[PDB]
C-alpha cells in the first residue's frame with residue numbers, strides 16, 4: 184500500500200526528491216486541524232498531507248489539489264500555486280503563505296483588510312462562473328461533476344449546516360442560556376421547511392464547482408493580498424453557497440464587534456456582493472457558450488436566483504456556527520458571558536430572518552439594513 | 560484482451576438465447592436504426608442490442624439495462640423483466656410484450672386505454688421517489704448519479720427539447736405555413752428566458768433517476784396492462800421532467816382528435832397527475848429518510864415545485880414535437896393539410912402558455928381548462 188504518513192524528515196526528503204530544493208532545510212509541522220498535517224519547509228514550501236485517523240477518507244487530498252489547480256486557472260493571484268500533487272500519498276505541495284494571516288484571526292484582532300471583499304468577490308465570480316454550464320460544454324461539465332463528487336465532505340455539510348442545528352440533535356453545542364431561543368427555532372415549522380429546501384438545493388443543484396467551506400478561517404489576508412485555501416469540501420453544488428457562507432462569516436465578525444467598529448464589515452458584505460455580481464456578469468458577457476445568454480433579462484433573473492439562495496445559505500451558516508458542533512472564534516470569544524449570549528441570540532434571529540425573508544430582499548443593501556435593525 | 564463487441568444477427572441472437580439456457584424462430588423487429596430488437600419464439604424472448612453505426616456510443620445499453628432493473632425493483636408489473644444483460648455486447652435480454660400495442664399507435668387508432676394514467680401515475684410516483692435523496696442515503700444516491708451520468712443522450716434532449724425549437728436552428732423541421740407563428744416564438748424574449756431556466760434545471764437538478772424520454776411511443780398498452788420501455792435517456796435529472804413529457808404527449812393526442820373524442824385524454828391528464836401525487840405522497844410518508852419529511856407543508860411545497868416544472872417541461876415538449884427535428888405521428892398524420900397546420904399552431908400556442916404561466920396554475924384542472932379554451 185503506497186500511502187505512508189509523513190514526518191518532518193520525510194517531508195524534507197520528498198521536497199528534495201521533487202527538485203524543489205538543492206538541498207540545508209528546516210521543517211516544522213504547523214497544521215491546526217486533526218485530519219491533515221501541514222509541513223513548512225524553509226525560499227520556502229508547504230506540504231499538506233491528509234491523515235486517515237488510524238474518520239475521513241484521504242481522497243479529499245485529490246479533490247483539494249484538483250480544486251486548487253482549477254481555481255488557479257482563472258484566479259492564480261488569489262490561490263496558492265501548486266507545485267506537485269499525489270493522490271496515493273494524499274499530498275499537495277504548494278506555495279508558502281506564512282507572510283499572511285488567516286482572515287478570521289486578523290479580523291478579531293481588529294484588522295480591516297480594505298481589499299478583502301474586492302478580492303473575494305473576484306474569486307467568487309470567476310471560480311463560480313468558469314466551472315458552470317454557462318462556461319463549459321455540457322459533456323465536459325458532466326465529467327467534472329463525476330471527478331469532484333465528494334460524498335463524505337458533503338455529508339458533513341448536509342448534517343452540520345442544513346440539518347442538526349434545526350432539531351434537538353446530539354452534535355449541537357450551545358449554552359443553556361440560549362435554550363429558550365434555540366427551542367423557538369426548533370418549533371418554527373415555516374423556517375424549517377425553508378431550511379429543508381435550501382438543503383435540497385445543496386443535495387441536488389450541480390451548478391458549478393464550489394469551494395464548499397469558504398469562511399474567514401479558510402482565507403489568508405494582509406493589507407494588500409488575499410488567498411483562498413483548503414478547498415477540501417469542493418464539489419458541484421449551488422452557485423449561491425460559497426457567496427452565502429462568506430457573507431455570513433462577515434456578519435459573524437460584525438456581531439463580535441461594537442458600534443462603529445462594525446462598519447468595515449458591513450462595507451465588506453456590500454462590496455463582495457457588488458464585486459461578485461460585476462465579475463460574474465463580465466465573465467457571462469465575454470465567455471458564455473449559451474445561446475440564451477444575451478436575451479435581455481436572463482442574466483438579471485439568474486443573478487436574482489443566486490442572490491436569494493446566497494441569503495438563505497448565509498442564514499443557515501449564521502445559525503449553524505452559533506449552536507451547532509462547529510463554532511466560530513468571533514462569537515465564542517466575546518466577553519462578558521452575558522454579552523456573548525446576547526450576540527449569539529442575535530446570530531440566531533438574523534439567520535432565521537435571512538432564511539425566511541431571502542426572496543423579499545431586492546439588493547444587498549436591504550440585507551445589510553435589515554441586519555443592522557435587528558442587531559441595534 | 561481483444562474488443563468483445565460484435566453486431567448480432569437472427570442466428571447469433573438465437574445462439575445467445577440458448578447459451579443463456581432460456582426449435583426457435585427469430586425476426587428483427589426494431590423501428591429505429593440505433594438498436595436491433597430480436598424477437599425469439601418457441602414462450603418468447605426479446606434481445607435488444609445497441610448499434611454503433613446521430614452517432615451514439617453503445618454505452619446507452621448499460622444505462623438502459625440498469626435503468627430497467629432499477630425500475631423493476633419498485634414497479635416490476637410496469638416494466639419488462641430483464642433476464643440477462645451485458646455491457647460489452649451492449650445487449651439486454653428481456654420479457655416479450657408483443658401481445659401489447661405501443662400506446663401512441665393505439666391512441667391514434669382510437670383506443671382509450673382506461674387504466675393508462677392510473678398505471679403511468681404509479682410508475683412516475685414510485686420510480687421518481689425511490690431514487691431521490693428523499694428515499695436514499697445521500698452517499699448512495701451520489702454514486703447512482705455517477706453510474707447514470709448520460710452525456711450523449713442528455714445532449715440530444717438539451718438540444719432538441721430545450722434549445723433548437725426556440726431559435727432558427729438547422730435541426731428544426733416545420734411547414735412554411737407555420738413560419739409566422741414560429742417566428743413569433745423566436746421573437747418572444749420572456750418565454751425564451753423561461754425555456755432557458757427550464758433547461759438550466761435539466762442541466763443541473765440531479766433530484767432523481769428519471770426515464771428521460773417517457774412519451775406514448777415509449778409505452779406498451781392494452782385494455783388491462785401498461786409497460787414502460789426504452790429508458791435509454793435515463794440519468795439523474797428533475798423530478799417533473801418525466802411527468803411533463805408524458806402529459807404533453809397526452810395533450811398532443813388530444814390535439815389530433817376532435818370534439819368529444821378528446822375527453823378520455825383530458826381525463827388521462829387529470830388522473831396521471833392525481834395518481835402521481837397520491838403515489839409520491841404515500842411513498843414520502845412511508846419511506847422518507849429525511850428528518851424534515853413530516854413537517855406540515857413541506858410535502859405540499861415540494862409537490863408544488865414538481866407541478867410547476869412538469870407544466871413547463873410539458874410546454875417545451877408540445878413545442879419541440881411540433882417544429883423540431885423529432886415529430887409525433889399524432890400531429891403529422893392529421894388530415895387535411897390545413898387542419899394539420901391549425902392544430903400545429905395550437906400545439907405551439909398551448910406549449911408557450913404552459914411555459915409562461917406554469918407557476919400560476921394551482922391544480923391540474925387549471926391546466927386542462929386553459930388548454931381546452933385555447934384549442935376551442
Ligand SMILES: Nc1ncnc2c1ncn2[C@@H]1O[C@H](COP(=O)(O)OP(=O)(O)O)[C@@H](O)[C@H]1O
Nearest residue numbers: 213214215216219221229263278279280281413
Ligand atoms: N500554504 C500555506 N502557507 C502557510 N501556512 C499554511 C498554508 N496552508 C496551510 N497553512 C497553515 O496550516 C493551517 C491549517 O491549514 P488547512 O489547509 O486549513 O488544514 P486543515 O484542512 O486541516 O484545516 C492554516 O491555518 C495555516 O496556518
Ligand SMILES: Nc1ncnc2c1ncn2[C@@H]1O[C@H](COP(=O)(O)OP(=O)(O)O)[C@@H](O)[C@H]1O
Nearest residue numbers: 588589590591594596605639654655656657789
Ligand atoms: N420487450 C419487448 N417486447 C415486444 N416488443 C418489443 C419489446 N421491446 C421493443 N419492442 C419492439 O421494438 C420496437 C423498438 O423498441 P425500442 O426499445 O423502442 O428501441 P429503439 O430504442 O430503437 O426505439 C418497439 O416499438 C416495439 O415494437
Ligand SMILES: [Ho]
Nearest residue numbers: 216400401413
Ligand atoms: Ho482549515
Ligand SMILES: [Ho]
Nearest residue numbers: 216413414415
Ligand atoms: Ho480542511
Ligand SMILES: [Ho]
Nearest residue numbers: 591776777789
Ligand atoms: Ho423507442
Ligand SMILES: [Ho]
Nearest residue numbers: 591594789791
Ligand atoms: Ho431508444
